[PDB]
Symmetry: C3
Subunit: 95 residues, 3 copies
């Protein structure tokens, strides 16, 4: 059934991020942060619980199938195809 | 023993590709294309339904365990070990 | 609660490695070896059954959630955060 499993890890958000926000790793600290929508293949998960700069840990999805319209993509990710394969290689996919 | 889940995403194949063909992302468009068999760690999935250059969306496995002899590796992938770990880090593995 | 699936792949350990040891791919042979704890994002799995340099094949975890305290991290991995996100992007996560 391809269940959407959650996970937790240190977060380094710099602002509020609603649930369904794509995440990537900060190349410096390696904490989870919002995917910029421009670094190819950097997306690693989807935030499952709303969080902000005070959240020391984030709860995010590490698997499952998510609908293209439900994911809250960053504005900078203007290409539909690149968004649809943003998680290729992970256990997450987009429909 | 682990479920072989499928996923779908934009396709950009250059030619006909049968099911069980290892896929990677086109470095430019980021559409799914056949794994070249030489770019280390580029494989992201295994084509689940035969397709070709006219297929705009492909269906592929994003998880599961597959027999080394069942996967249709590209001729350029000439090293058995490199093929067997081509999916290390994804939900797919080879047996 | 997510299942911890195992997998097998060629091994290139240079010494004895107990279960729960993080694994990465050797850049040259691409066999599974112990993660060095310094190459960012190189961890691809966690050894599931003890092995050593004579082990031609390793059985490892390719998914699941594991306790930070249960994983036998290499000494070089001295930053807690980097260890906690060492598997981000794979089906494995740390709690």
């Amino acid at each position: 059934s391809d269940p959407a499993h959650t996970a937790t890890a240190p977060g380094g958000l710099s602002a509020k991020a609603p649930a369904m926000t794509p995440l990537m790793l900060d190349t410096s600290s390696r904490k989870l942060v919002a995917w910029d929508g421009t670094t190819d293949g950097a997306a690693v998960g989807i935030l499952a619980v709303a969080a902000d700069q005070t959240s020391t840990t984030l709860t995010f999805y590490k698997s499952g199938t998510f609908r293209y319209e439900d994911v809250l993509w960053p504005e900078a990710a203007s290409d539909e195809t690149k968004k649809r394969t943003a998680f290729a290689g992970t256990a997450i996919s987009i429909v």
